[PDB]
Amino acid sequence: MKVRASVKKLCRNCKIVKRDGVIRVICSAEPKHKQRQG
Amino acid sequence: IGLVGKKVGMTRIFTEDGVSIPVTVIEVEANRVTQVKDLANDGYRAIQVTTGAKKANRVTKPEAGHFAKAGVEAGRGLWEFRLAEGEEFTVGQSISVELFADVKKVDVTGTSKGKGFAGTVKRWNFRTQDATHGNSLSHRVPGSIGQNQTPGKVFKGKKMAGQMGNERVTVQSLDVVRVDAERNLLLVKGAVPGATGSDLIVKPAVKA
C-alpha cells in the first residue's frame, strides 16, 4: 500500500475506514488503491 | 539433577573406528545428600549434597553438627541442586555416577584458572598498537577510553585491565563418553574449567 499523507478516494469502489486511529482507504477492484495514513 | 566432582587431568579415548576423542577425566565420588529443602520450609524444592572426606579437627562444630543431623560423614564442602518436580530424594542417600549413564550431554561448571591481573590485550583481545613506527611508551596500552566533553566520562562496563579468571564459568553440552562405576569416573569430550584437582559441578544438558 501507499502511506501518503493525503489519502483519497481514487476509484468508485474505494472506501475510507478509520482503523486503530489511522485513516485507511480499502478497495475491492484494484488492490493498488489500498492506502494508509493522513 | 547434578553431581559434584574433582577434575583429574585429561586423556584421549581411541575408538577402533580411527578417531581419538580428547576426554577430561572427572572422578565423581559418592555424592551424599545432607539436607532436602522443600516448598513448606524454604520456598523452593532442592537438595544439598556433599562429597569426599574431611579431617576430624579441620571440620568445625557448626558443620559437624549439620553433618550429624543427616548421619553422613563430613564431606569436603557443600553444594546444592534444584529438583525437577518428578524426582525426589531422601536424606543420607549416596548418589552414584550411574545417574549420567542414560544421558548423552552435560554442562560442566567450574571455577576457571586464575590468570591474575590481566592487561586489556590478554583479557579483552585488544589489539596491540604499532610495535615501532615511532610509538612512544604505548604498545600494549588500551588507547582511548572515551569520547570528549559530551559524556565527559568513561561509560560503565568499559573493557579495562584487571582480574582475569578465578571466576565461575560453564562449558555447555559436552558429550559424555564413558561412565565407569567401578573406579567412579565420568569421561567427557573436551576441556572443562579449573585445574587438575579443582571442584567441578557436572549436571545434565539444558539445551536438549
Binding site: - | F155, K156, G157, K158
Partner: protein
C-alpha cells in the same frame, strides 16, 4: 511565645488499612502521601515524620482511566552505557504490582531523608492477606 513543634518521642503513630481494589491510582496515591506525610494531623511539623502507618492491600487491582493500562510507561536507566529499560502499566502489574503504588507515592512524597523515612511507613501488598494483624490496623477510606 514560640510555637509548637511535634517532638518525635511524643509523636502518636496510628495504623491503617486501605483496600485499593478498583480505586484510581493517583487519587489513592495522593491521599496516601497526605497521610504518610502527616498533613491531616493538626500537630503537623514539616521537619518531623508525624504521619501514620498505612497498609495498602490489593495493589494489583488498582484501576487506571483511559488507555493508561497499556500506554502509561515506567522508564528507568540501569546506570549503564546505553541501558534504558521501559515497562508499560500492564507489564508492571504482571511482574511487580507493588512497584505501581510505591512509585506513585514516592513521587508525591518530599525528596530527602524525611521523605525516605515517611515512605518506610507505607506497606504495599499484591494480595488481600497482610501479616500486620498485631498492630490492629483500622480501616481507612
Amino acid at each position: 511565645m514560640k510555637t509548637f513543634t511535634a517532638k518525635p518521642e511524643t509523636v502518636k503513630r496510628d495504623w491503617y488499612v486501605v483496600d485499593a481494589t478498583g480505586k484510581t491510582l493517583g487519587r489513592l496515591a495522593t491521599e496516601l502521601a497526605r497521610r504518610l506525610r502527616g498533613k491531616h494531623k493538626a500537630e503537623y511539623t514539616p521537619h518531623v515524620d508525624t504521619g501514620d502507618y498505612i497498609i495498602v492491600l490489593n495493589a494489583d487491582k488498582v484501576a487506571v482511566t483511559g488507555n493508561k493500562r497499556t500506554d502509561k510507561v515506567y522508564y528507568h536507566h540501569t546506570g549503564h552505557i546505553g541501558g534504558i529499560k521501559q515497562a508499560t502499566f500492564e507489564e508492571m502489574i504482571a511482574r511487580r504490582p507493588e512497584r505501581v503504588i510505591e512509585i506513585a507515592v514516592k513521587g508525591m512524597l518530599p525528596k530527602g531523608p524525611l521523605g525516605r523515612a515517611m515512605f518506610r511507613k507505607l506497606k504495599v501488598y499484591a494480595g488481600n492477606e497482610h501479616n500486620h494483624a498485631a498492630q490492629q490496623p483500622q480501616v481507612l477510606d
